[PDB]
């Protein structure tokens, strides 16, 4: 059935509740972000009103079908009504598309919930600072002290220094990189652009991207993987195997490849900087995992919540298990704590 942390109080609305049927009571469903765990269950079959970012919008449109009168796209930081409640989207610093929800309740309380981000000290300067936020529904997908990592800047000056010495030392090498959703374009277009190259993709891969309004993209990607020597894959590709076969296919054009996997984090974080990362290399391929995240680190999420000071907070990642969800609410307490809220 619904989860509670999926309802929003007060209202009939849910958030990213698309694999229950028909939810009883709601009469608008809010989407933050196209991620198939969040957007599970929607398709051209799909009849209630659907809210969310013009981005998320034009992907729901093109890759699901879902037909245009049941999409409601809304302009971020911008006052709207809903259902006769007032919400604001912020923008998330997740993937393209991605929001945050303001609800503005009847009663006088304001709830906030974060979908999935990545928190940065700009979002003190947003529509948030204006008024108190009493209840937080919050992204704790990395809520423990294990998980740092480095900026997405330093992540990206390491990728492009990386790609452009190996292909300068041997012009014939290929750079791959893998995908398998929305999100990290950073990657993948900072390299190539370095390169002086079009990255290259599947008919279906360059589709999801041509929804993205991101500037001058007819620039920087292209269906003919001939004239390009960045090649994005999926992600199930990126080993020795998968590599080997692609580079058969590309008719000794290329004789080396340097191939990057932008996963999460990985415990290779906990010991090493960001300056000593190493391949794993067989033959002619090598294969860089780079630590480039779209959530919030340990550190990042607490003063986001040392700064917000909410009266509640409802987790919404890592709910599953009794010993997480008691780790998580002792970090929260501790925070409270120390700031004093
Ligand atoms: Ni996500």
Redesign the pocket.
């Known amino acids: 059935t619904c989860p509670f942390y999926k309802k929003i109080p007060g209202t009939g609305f849910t958030v990213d509740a698309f694999q229950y049927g028909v939810v009883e009571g709601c009469t608008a469903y809010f989407l ?2 196209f ?1 198939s ?2 957007y599970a269950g929607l398709s051209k079959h799909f009849t209630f009103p659907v809210y969310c970012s013009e981005i998320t919008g034009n992907l729901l449109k093109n890759k699901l079908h879902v037909q245009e009168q049941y999409i409601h796209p809304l302009p971020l930081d911008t006052e709207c009504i809903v259902n006769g409640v007032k919400v604001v989207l912020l923008d998330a610093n ?2 393209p598309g ?1 929001v945050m929800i303001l609800f503005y309740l009847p009663n006088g309380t304001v709830i906030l919930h974060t ?2 981000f990545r928190a940065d000290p700009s979002m003190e300067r947003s529509l948030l600072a204006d008024q108190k936020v009493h209840m937080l529904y919050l992204d704790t997908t990395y809520c423990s002290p294990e998980y740092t990592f480095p900026s997405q800047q330093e992540v990206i000056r390491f990728a492009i220094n990386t790609a452009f010495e190996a292909v300068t030392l041997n012009p014939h090498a290929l750079v791959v990189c893998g995908t398998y ?1 929305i ?1 990290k374009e950073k990657v993948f277009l900072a390299i190539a652009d370095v390169l002086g190259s079009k990255v290259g993709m599947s008919q279906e891969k360059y589709k999801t991207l041509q929804c993205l309004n991101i500037p001058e993209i007819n620039s920087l990607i292209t269906t003919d993987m001939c004239s390009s020597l960045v090649h994005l894959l999926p992600m199930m590709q990126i080993n020795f195997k998968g590599l080997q076969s692609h580079l058969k296919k590309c008719g000794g054009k290329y004789n080396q490849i340097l191939a990057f996997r932008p996963t999460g984090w990985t415990h290779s974080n906990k010991f090493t900087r960001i300056a000593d990362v190493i391949p794993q290399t067989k033959g002619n391929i090598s294969i860089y995992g780079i630590p480039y995240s ?2 919030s680190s340990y550190l990042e999420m607490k003063r986001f919540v040392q700064w917000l000071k909410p009266q509640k907070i409802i987790p919404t990642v890592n709910v599953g298990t009794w010993k997480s969800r008691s780790t998580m609410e002792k970090y929260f307490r501790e925070w409270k704590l120390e700031a004093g809220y």
């Open positions: 933050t972000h991620h765990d969040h997740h993937c991605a979908g999935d959703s999100g779209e959530h």
